[PDB]
Amino acid sequence: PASEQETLVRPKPLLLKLLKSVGAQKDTYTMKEVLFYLGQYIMTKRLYDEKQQHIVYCSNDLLGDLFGVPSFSVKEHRKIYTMIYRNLVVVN
Ligand SMILES: COc1ccc(C2=N[C@@H](c3ccc(Cl)cc3)[C@@H](c3ccc(Cl)cc3)N2C(=O)N2CCNC(=O)C2)c(OC(C)C)c1
Ligand SMILES: [Cl-]
């Protein structure tokens, strides 16, 4: 592959369940794809605050079970990446 910065990942089963609900089923995804799909899952389910759309409340949604937090701001990039990595493996 041309892009040295790309990340290929294999989601854990429950992350795969989430991704399949919003997107295509694949063996391997890229990290940028996973980020995009997670955001669109949030949009599709309206997990954000309508009057503060950069805040997400996900407790007891599948997303909250995966991330292990009840809520987060989309500005919290370290948190979002680290939680995502806790839900997949990077491909060798
Ligand atoms: C002012 O309101 C905003 C501002 C930015 C984001 C956002 N920001 C993008 C983003 C966030 C964090 C990282 Cl680490 C990377 C990208 C991306 C995203 C990706 C993954 C997750 Cl878990 C959540 C959001 N993401 C989005 O998914 N957005 C923005 C672009 N188009 C959309 O339809 C939704 C946003 O997300 C909602 C889904 C809550 C809302
Ligand atoms: Cl994105």
UniProtKB/Swiss-Prot annotation:
Q: Which residues form the SWIB/MDM2 domain?
A: 7-90
Q: How is it modified after translation?
A: Phosphorylated at multiple sites near the RING domain by ATM upon DNA damage; this promotes its ubiquitination and degradation, preventing p53/TP53 degradation. Autoubiquitination leads to proteasomal degradation; resulting in p53/TP53 activation it may be regulated by SFN. Also ubiquitinated by TRIM13. ATM-phosphorylated MDM2 is ubiquitinated by the SCF(FBXO31) complex in response to genotoxic stress, promoting its degradation and p53/TP53-mediated DNA damage response. Deubiquitinated by USP2 leads to its accumulation and increases deubiquitination and degradation of p53/TP53. Deubiquitinated by USP7 leading to its stabilization.
Q: What is the effect of changing residue 39 to A?
A: No effect on its ability to induce apoptosis
Residues of the region (Necessary for interaction with USP2) are 1-91
- Spans annotated as Sufficient to promote the mitochondrial pathway of apoptosis: 1-82
Q: In which tissues is it expressed?
A: Ubiquitous. Isoform Mdm2-A, isoform Mdm2-B, isoform Mdm2-C, isoform Mdm2-D, isoform Mdm2-E, isoform Mdm2-F and isoform Mdm2-G are observed in a range of cancers but absent in normal tissues.
Induction line: By DNA damage.
Q: Which domain of life is it from?
A: Eukaryota
Q: Where in the cell is it found?
A: Nucleus, Nucleoplasm; Cytoplasm; Nucleus, Nucleolus; Nucleus
Function comment? E3 ubiquitin-protein ligase that mediates ubiquitination of p53/TP53, leading to its degradation by the proteasome. Inhibits p53/TP53- and p73/TP73-mediated cell cycle arrest and apoptosis by binding its transcriptional activation domain. Also acts as a ubiquitin ligase E3 toward itself and ARRB1. Permits the nuclear export of p53/TP53. Promotes proteasome-dependent ubiquitin-independent degradation of retinoblastoma RB1 protein. Inhibits DAXX-mediated apoptosis by inducing its ubiquitination and degradation. Component of the TRIM28/KAP1-MDM2-p53/TP53 complex involved in stabilizing p53/TP53.
UniProt record similarity statement: Belongs to the MDM2/MDM4 family.
> What pathology does the entry list?
Seems to be amplified in certain tumors (including soft tissue sarcomas, osteosarcomas and gliomas). A higher frequency of splice variants lacking p53 binding domain sequences was found in late-stage and high-grade ovarian and bladder carcinomas. Four of the splice variants show loss of p53 binding. Lessel-Kubisch syndrome: An autosomal recessive progeroid syndrome characterized by short stature, pinched facial features, prematurely gray hair, scleroderma-like skin changes, small kidneys and consecutive kidney failure, followed by severe arterial hypertension.
Misc. remarks from the entry: MDM2 RING finger mutations that failed to ubiquitinate p53 in vitro did not target p53 for degradation when expressed in cells.
Self-association and partners: Interacts with p53/TP53, TP73/p73, RBL5 and RP11. Binds specifically to RNA. Can interact with RB1, E1A-associated protein EP300 and the E2F1 transcription factor. Forms a ternary complex with p53/TP53 and WWOX. Interacts with CDKN2AIP, RFWD3, USP7, PYHIN1, and RBBP6. Interacts with ARRB1 and ARRB2. Interacts with PSMA3. Found in a trimeric complex with MDM2, MDM4 and USP2. Interacts with USP2 (via N-terminus and C-terminus). Interacts with MDM4. Part of a complex with MDM2, DAXX, RASSF1 and USP7. Part of a complex with DAXX, MDM2 and USP7. Interacts directly with DAXX and USP7. (Microbial infection) Interacts with herpes virus 8 protein v-IRF4.
How are the domains described in the entry?
A: Region I is sufficient for binding p53 and inhibiting its G1 arrest and apoptosis functions. It also binds p73 and E2F1. Region II contains most of a central acidic region required for interaction with ribosomal protein L5 and a putative C4-type zinc finger. The RING finger domain which coordinates two molecules of zinc interacts specifically with RNA whether or not zinc is present and mediates the heterooligomerization with MDM4. It is also essential for its ubiquitin ligase E3 activity toward p53 and itself.
The name on file for this protein is: E3 ubiquitin-protein ligase Mdm2
Task: Show which stretch of the intact protein is covered.
Answer: 20 to 111 of 491
